[PDB]
Swiss-Prot record, chain A:
General activator of RNA polymerase III transcription. Residues 61-87, 252-273 are annotated as: Disordered. Belongs to the TFC5 family. The gene is BDP1. Residues 147-198 form the SANT domain. Residues 61-74, 252-261 have a biased composition (Basic and acidic residues). TFIIIB comprises the TATA-binding protein (TBP), the B-related factor (BRF) and the B'' component (BDP1). Interacts with TFC4. It comes from Saccharomyces cerevisiae (strain ATCC 204508 / S288c) (Baker's yeast). This is Transcription factor TFIIIB component B''. Signal peptide: none annotated.
Swiss-Prot record, chain B:
Belongs to the RNA polymerase beta chain family. It comes from the Eukaryota. It is found in: Nucleus. Component of the RNA polymerase III (Pol III) complex consisting of 17 subunits. This is DNA-directed RNA polymerase III subunit RPC2. DNA-dependent RNA polymerase catalyzes the transcription of DNA into RNA using the four ribonucleoside triphosphates as substrates. Second largest core component of RNA polymerase III which synthesizes small RNAs, such as 5S rRNA and tRNAs. Proposed to contribute to the polymerase catalytic activity and forms the polymerase active center together with the largest subunit. Pol III is composed of mobile elements and RPC2 is part of the core element with the central large cleft and probably a clamp element that moves to open and close the cleft. Present with 1950 molecules/cell in log phase SD medium. The chain holds residues 51 to 100 of 1149 of the full protein.
Curated annotation (Swiss-Prot), chain C:
Component of the RNA polymerase III (Pol III) complex consisting of 17 subunits. Interacts with BRF1/TDS4. The chain holds residues 11 to 157 of 317 of the full protein. This is DNA-directed RNA polymerase III subunit RPC6. It is found in: Nucleus. The lineage of its organism: Eukaryota, Fungi, Dikarya, Ascomycota, Saccharomycotina. Signal peptide: none annotated.
Length: 273, 50, 147
């Protein structure tokens, strides 16, 4: 009904309310409240919308098979929202560059460098873009590291048993074979699957299947080139040879500059007397 | 005159004018706290009251 | 960059020993105002900066190196290539830490992260003096002067 002191100390309190029994521990509205309505009401709402936000992130991460690139896609979407806010609230990109010609101008265009006193003057930029309302929320109890997981897919389990029958305990390849999970959680999956089942794992180590469909999935879902050991070894040897030639050329140029400096010092000693 | 304003008002009226006007006014002269490192951070005083 | 062929014109005029006569010829070729506008754009495209003297405008200095790239050593910040350009024109011996503290009125730990992020790709190859009054170090290359 509303906030009103019905009764207490005699029976189930019913003067103006919707209660008809004692032991109101379950939802714990009983009598009436007159403290912290909206700031405590809009806290579980914010928590619930952030949990639905993380769930739809976990749903979107299934499509793009790159976790951290999905996070950068998320921040790319929110900076698309930021440039939409730049369209909304407000040229506008008044910033600097790697050189001193910053603005408008690089200098004066009449006779000479006129605006060099103004071009030589970072912290004046565009920032009134991202405006968001406030709260008085919290993240305590335990904050920092953690693991956001889910009840695992049985088709992922079938793919895992087929993988372990095809390409076994290869932690980095197993983490890359599921390129939207992570590393420590699939290690907990390794010890969990090592726990409960001897039969299919023993038949899997009996099988010894050759790894071709695994490389097929790793070259399609990642779009990685996978150049062989001869091509990659030749590229690494060519990079090492180019670095050694650059170091030798730098040493020879430093020796030539030191010889030129010694000749210039001898010429200055000859011109001093 | 003693009923409207009173005898001792050399402190009460001045302190009330202080906490009504000057305590809110002089904070606007010092509100921008921009730092050297990471040129993005700032606070900005919009209201102050006792 | 790839604005127009005036990058190649800047390379051809900055091949040899240049002076104000090269800029006289560069303003002498076409109509003056469009040349001044596009040359201001080319100088805003990380190129040679003009020099205020008794004479009108000079080049900096004689070569066509054009290596700052403004975004790519490990991260992206428009403060690092600035400091690299500050230590390009140090001169004979080098530049102080107190001198680069005095210019640009910045903090000292941003100078330390410039030190680390540019030492990660070998441009902080220093030459040490005999005495150390204020660390007269961090020249470009070759450990040339030796007092």
């Amino acid at each position: 009904k509303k906030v009103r002191d019905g009764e207490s100390a005699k029976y189930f309190i019913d003067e103006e309310n919707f209660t008809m029994a004692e032991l109101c521990k379950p939802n714990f509205p009983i009598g009436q409240i007159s403290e912290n309505f909206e700031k405590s009401k809009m806290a579980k709402k914010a928590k619930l919308e952030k949990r639905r936000h993380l769930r739809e992130l976990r749903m979107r991460a299934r499509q793009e098979f790159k976790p951290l690139h999905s996070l950068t896609k998320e921040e790319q979407e929110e900076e698309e929202e930021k440039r939409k806010e730049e369209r909304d609230k407000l040229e506008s990109d008044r910033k600097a560059h790697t050189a001193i010609q910053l603005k408008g101008t690089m200098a004066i265009d009449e006779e000479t460098m006129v605006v060099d006193r103004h071009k030589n003057a970072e912290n004046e930029y565009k920032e009134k873009v991202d405006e968001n309302p406030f709260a008085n929320l919290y993240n305590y109890g335990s904050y920092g590291r953690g693991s956001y997981t889910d009840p695992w897919t049985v088709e992922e389990m079938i793919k895992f048993y087929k993988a372990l029958s095809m390409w076994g305990t290869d932690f980095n390849l197993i983490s890359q074979l599921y390129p939207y999970r992570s590393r420590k959680q699939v290690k907990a999956k390794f010890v969990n699957e090592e726990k409960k089942r001897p039969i299919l794992i023993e038949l899997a180590l009996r099988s010894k299947l050759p790894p071709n469909f695994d490389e097929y999935c790793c070259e399609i879902k990642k779009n990685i080139g996978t150049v062989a050991d001869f091509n990659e070894k030749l590229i690494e040897l060519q990079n090492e040879h180019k670095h050694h030639m650059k170091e030798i050329e730098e040493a020879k140029n430093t020796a030539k500059e030191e010889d030129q400096t010694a000749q210039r010092l001898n010429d200055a000693n000859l011109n001093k007397k | 005159f003693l009923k409207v304003k009173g005898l001792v008002k050399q402190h009460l009226d001045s302190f009330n004018y202080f906490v009504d006007t000057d305590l809110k006014k002089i904070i606007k002269a010092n509100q921008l706290i921009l730092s050297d490192v990471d040129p993005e951070f700032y606070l900005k005083y919009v209201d102050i009251r006792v | 960059l790839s604005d127009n062929a005036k990058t190649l014109h800047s390379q051809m005029m900055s091949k040899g020993i240049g002076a104000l006569f090269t800029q006289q010829e560069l303003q002498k070729q076409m109509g003056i105002g469009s040349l001044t506008d596009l040359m201001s754009i080319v100088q805003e495209l990380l190129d040679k900066n003009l020099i205020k003297l008794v004479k009108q405008n000079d080049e900096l200095k004689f070569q066509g190196v054009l290596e700052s790239e403004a975004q790519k050593k490990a991260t992206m910040s428009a403060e690092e290539a600035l400091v690299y350009s500050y230590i390009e024109a140090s001169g004979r011996e080098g530049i102080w830490s107190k001198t680069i503290k005095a210019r640009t009125n910045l903090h000292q730990h941003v100078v330390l992260k410039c030190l680390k992020s540019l030492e990660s790709q070998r441009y902080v190859k220093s030459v040490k003096s005999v005495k150390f009054p204020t660390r007269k170090i961090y020249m470009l290359y070759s450990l040339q002067p030796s007092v």
